[PDB]
Amino acid sequence: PSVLEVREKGYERLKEELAKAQRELKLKDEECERLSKVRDQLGQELEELTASLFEEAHKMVREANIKQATAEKQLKEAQGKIDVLQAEVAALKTLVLS
Amino acid sequence: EKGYERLKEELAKAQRELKLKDEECERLSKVRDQLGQELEELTASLFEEAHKMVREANIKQATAEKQLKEAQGKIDVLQAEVAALKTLV
Amino acid sequence: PSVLEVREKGYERLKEELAKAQRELKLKDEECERLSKVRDQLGQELEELTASLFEEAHKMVREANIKQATAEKQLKEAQGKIDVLQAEVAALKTLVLS
Amino acid sequence: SVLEVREKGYERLKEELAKAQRELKLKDEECERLSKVRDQLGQELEELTASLFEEAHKMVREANIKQATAEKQLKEAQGKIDVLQAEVAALKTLVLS
């Protein structure tokens, strides 16, 4: 009797709730897709920035090595000049002290 | 250097948000599945009820038709007796 | 080569493995979407078939009720005719008795 | 045989739907597995990246230190050259006096 009417009402009601859940799930899925694409773009940008930072570090190391090598070569020349000047200094001091 | 840490934190935040909404989507999917199963069981019950209604309606129809046939046979007998009695008169 | 060209090899190796996992995951996701659409189409078709079966059931019930009602009305007519014929049988029996 | 016909078609389509459901569930589990693998690889790449940054900073600092040392020793050598040249000028001024 009335239980059958509650059964048909429950059938159409449950069908409508199922459709509503489908709509909500589809909408939130699309939102998840948007956020996933945003996440991928941010990841790629961070990837490029990371590579750029690594290259920049290597470049700075190379430049420091170049300046170091220049300073060391100029140091060798300066040491030879120091040896010459010290020999001439010893000669002059020995000449004065007589 | 500032851009690296900022962008990194933004990426981590986007990861957290995406994970949250994904888990919510999974919850809604499970709810949807439960509703579908409930509709399946209710549908089966409704089919059993429908078969019951068809069988009962067919039974009642057969009963009414049978009683009509019996009444028609009785009419035939009574008409034969009426014809015989009128032939007697 | 140094740290740059060694950690570049390892870094790019792990990076490529991650890219491979991402591509495979995307492919399987797309297949899940296709199969999900197939499932939805089959479900909707099952809904239509179910509705058709219910409508057919109600139609058969209605037709059976119609035939039953016709048989009952004709039964009432038959009962009245039986009453008339029985009255005529008793009356003619009384006439022949006299 | 009405019920057998409608039951046959209904159960046929229902069984096809069940098959689609099983396939979808299997592929979903596969997607979850692949997602976990992807996450593990991503975390490993994060840790490796941090290590690479620490090592890179180490290399930059050490290279700058070595450059500063060589330049400082060069400055000391230049100062010593200036001192020795002043001593040569003074001594030659004494000899020429």
Swiss-Prot record, chains A, C:
Phosphoserine: which positions carry it? S2
Please name the source species. Homo sapiens (Human)
- Which span of the entire protein is present here? 164 to 261 of 476
Question: Organism's domain of life?
Answer: Eukaryota
* Compartments it resides in: Cytoplasm; Nucleus; Cytoplasm, Cytoskeleton; Cell projection, Lamellipodium
- How is the protein altered post-translationally, as described in the entry? Phosphorylated by AKT1; the phosphorylation alters its GEF activity.
Task: Briefly state the protein's biological role.
Answer: Guanine nucleotide exchange factor (GEF) which may activate RAB8A and RAB8B. Promotes the exchange of GDP to GTP, converting inactive GDP-bound Rab proteins into their active GTP-bound form. Mediates the release of GDP from RAB8A and RAB8B but not from RAB3A or RAB5. Modulates actin organization and promotes polarized transport of RAB8A-specific vesicles to the cell surface. Together with RAB11A, RAB8A, the exocyst complex, PARD3, PRKCI, ANXA2, CDC42 and DNMBP promotes transcytosis of PODXL to the apical membrane initiation sites (AMIS), apical surface formation and lumenogenesis.
Q: Family per UniProt?
A: Belongs to the SEC2 family.
Name under which the protein is recorded: Rab-3A-interacting protein
